Amino acid sequence: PLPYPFAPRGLDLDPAYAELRERAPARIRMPYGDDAWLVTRYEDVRTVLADPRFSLAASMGRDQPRMRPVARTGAGLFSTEPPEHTRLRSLVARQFSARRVEPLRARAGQLADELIDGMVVAGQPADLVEDFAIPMPTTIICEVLGIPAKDHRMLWHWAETVLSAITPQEVLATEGRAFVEYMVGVLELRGREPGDDLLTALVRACREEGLISEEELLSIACDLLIAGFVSTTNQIGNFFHQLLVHPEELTRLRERPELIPKAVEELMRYVPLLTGFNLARYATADVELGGITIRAGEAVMIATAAANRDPEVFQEPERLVMDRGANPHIGFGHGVHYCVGAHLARLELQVAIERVLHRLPGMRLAVPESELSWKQDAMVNGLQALPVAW
Template identity: 70%
Template sequence: MVTQQRPIPYPFPPSRLEVHPRYGELRDLPLARVRLPYGEGAWLVTRHADVKTVLADQRFSLAAAVGRDQPRLRSMTRDGGGLFSKEPPEHTRLRSLVAKEFGARRVEGLRIRAREVADGLLDAMEAKGAPADLVDDFAIPLPTTIICELLGVPGADHRRLWGWAQSVLSNTSSEQELMTRGKELFGYLAGVLELRRREPGDDVLSGLVRACDEDEQITETELLALTCDLLIAGFVSTTNQIGNFFYQLLADPADLARLRDNPEAIPKAVEELMRYVPLLVGFTLPRYATEDVELGGVLIRSGDAVLVATAAANRDPEIFPDPEQLVLDRPVNPHVGFGHGVHYCIGAHLARLELQVALERVLHRMPGLRFAVPEDELSWKTDAMIIGLNALPVSW
């Protein structure tokens, strides 16, 4: 049983949507020790079965990371307060306040509205004429509009939120900038919550304000942290994946044509794209072992940090036949693109719907969609925790 190794520098350098080949090598070995630019060393988990264990086993705790010298890509550590820093029963209490609003039935009722928003954005792109930026003109405003309407955030502020999110998620922002931008964002959200107190509506934030003020189910601090979690998580990941998905399909015109000609295949294709297309630069938020655990051929000691690489797990040949191939009609697809266990993405149903609608409406409205610049001229984010394009110029 392995207990310690010389740490490997991590994360591995991303290259567009490529999954680094080192992950394949590590899957055949005991868990590896890694060292990030900041924080203490950690164990890296890459096999599908081990990743699911860490994500579901309460002996690996997100809450225990608060206050620790967490392995991370930037100097500042994350604070507690929201869903990403709590375990049951506190996590269950907070999640239960909003789970119904993000359930399958409630989200399916948003499909017509999502199509309306998508078509309105495509109308504007067509009116302006090609080329257009599929990121700025479509991928950003589509999920931002939907989550803001669902939460009860004023429409005029949607674009400001994207700017805040970009700064908060950047790995190159200085500590001062992160503190300043974070304070601006929380100040803005506090103002939105006050607005919902004065003018309550049929939206998520109005319900949360009532749960805080009338039912005392949530504290003011938790209310603000949960609002930030729902908002940022509600559009940042989906925005980047819309751009990533279209890049992947445009790079393989045969797959693009297959979906264009068979729109009924889009839901299954979204699941395969979620498996195949990496989103995170290496890993999820660190968890800490709360007791000694044997996993992946090593003894993880109580207090050790553990990182899971979902992109590596989604290419595990033990689970996925031909894992390096994009198979849009893959019949069985237990990917972990939305996580696993109690912290499974609360917005998974909403993200699925938005990704499906994005593919459906663009391919229907713009059947001749193509890159407007040579592929090697596309600009990718190099300073963020999430993989994505700065812009995706397209013609049609």
Template identity: 55%
Template sequence: MTATPLSYPFWTDHGLGVSTGYAPLRGGPLTRVRLPYGDEAWLATDYEDVRAVLSDGRFSLGEALRRDHPRIDPMPRAGGGLIALDAPRHTHLRTLLAREFTARRMEGLRARIAEVADGLLDRIEDAGSPADLVEDLSFPLPMTLICELVGVPAADVPSVRAWADVICSGSETPEALEQRGKDFFTRMHGWIEERRLAPADDLLTLLVRAHDDGSLTEDELTGLLGELLIAGFVTTTNQIANFFAVLLLPGEAGGDGTEWLTTLRSRPELIPRAVEELLRYVPLLNGLTLPRYALEDVELSGTLVREGEAVLVSQAAANHDPAVFPNPDRLVLDRPGAAHISFGHGIHYCLGAHLARLELQITLERVTTRLPGLRLAVPEEELRWRSREFFSGLRALPVAW
């Protein structure tokens, strides 16, 4: 055990590499860390340890709601959705939604995803070079699709993005966050009442009916709705831009800035495998995951985690564990072997993983097809990276073709 807890997260302010802070921790016991707010915690970084914590029912996500959990901002986590629950309640609520996100159901959206992507690329081509792949593609594509699935009125789609910007920045004051949250949830309650009066073929109608027949509480209804909207586009938005940053930047992932896109354009059958490798390679969450609390004493890699102690896992570090992924800091488009854990593991595995995969695959295919010669439109040193926020990535990605 470290005598003094390490300061965490290991922030990186530039690029998409995994922090060097994880390297000394590999292969040993868990590490004691302290975030800016809340309890101290154990940190798991090795692939097998992270999988164990994510899948072991003795580690509780819901318990964090009752404790001063470790976090980067002063506001404690709110409850209501799937990420606030453990089995069996989590299982009940997830079952309500799971059939709407099966691989077969999501595959039925392939044509619509391609249609949205092509519509956005039409605008990019019409406007001419340069374009911003963040603002012109990676934000509107997944946001449009999740808002359609949920049933958000078109006029209110900008409010969803605005709320996502607030909660993901980590820089709002508690007072501002509370007020903005009240404003957004007031708007959300308006959608709920509209669906009671005029049901439709969307997720909002499904949730309203589940609430009205007693399957969901009011807090669970709004919590699930908020999670669907934010998780349904924010992660994919960041990863679309991150993927192209990796593929375009000289030196990233061992490439030369052109070879990856050239390979994918000439061999589109590689795209599904390439998406999985990019999901492994890119550390989306800056090492931050929600804490889990031990419900009893649990031994993990020689560390006794006592009942009531918090454990954080770094999926980014686990995805770069050299014991599992040889030469982990190099991109291998058709990498064989173990699966990444970017979508999680166990009962909290990402509900929208099939949708995200399709969006990423189709976007990669359509861009490489329609924007030949894609390249950065500004010098690399002019790129603006997100700093000390929940998600890694770029604020803008200017490109030419």
């Protein structure tokens, strides 16, 4: 069985995936848990994500293929399938819809300008990671959820604990307990002190309409916070890294920002992001796939970055093509667990690029590229620092 996941080399896609896509799904061994089938062919990955015989509910109570020593528990979005999943996801779908995140664009741009101001005053070189990529989306999600600004540093510390694949088992537990107790507290605050935030809406949904349990309310609050903290923070840095090493693409996006949406989608397709956070599904019945049979009770994982370069789906899949037209990438997933944050992340990535490129027309790497350090043992690929001058 193939040891998995591969060790990332920057944001290179591992060359093994090219051969993997042209054979039957492979048997893989993760750091912990059951062995699994690994699916990399685009069509095979879409099938796993859309076919209800592949279930995240069925993985609860199993010895899941995973990165960390303790199998995951919980009763929320990552643990359920329809109809129960639908009941939870319906309650969050209003606030994260494109229609309701779009009014945040002006605020996101104002925040980006404040962060860039801070970089300017601090003087060159700046670090796009610590000075911009981390603060921007963490602030925004906190505002969406009604989380006080004072808790930013504490929550980023928890995010780093969550993000490291070598966090000691007992550190994860003790910090985890503290985080959960923190969120219990916030949910009581929102109960006494209602606001125009998402958690207030979710507290009412639970404690006045009885539409979700307390355990579900808590899991959704925790999930949205953690997701908001570990995802875009890394991806913003990744996208600026890719723009900085393709300077030819910079000036088009700087001068014609209407081109930024398609570029964000191409960068979503191109960037290999998810080293560790790939939830295995368990089959609930035998499924024929890729010429093998996945028996009931077996585990299946997907490689979206590999699917996103399947040459049967994307022309010249290994080329970064910033105006790429046919781009049905799986960078936000597919099926019922399709990213509920997709419109918010999309807006954050577009605004980040628009603001940074306009504010800092002379932006460039402040160190040689070979000197960049990538985060080691991270569940999500990302830079330790991104030194820039301008």
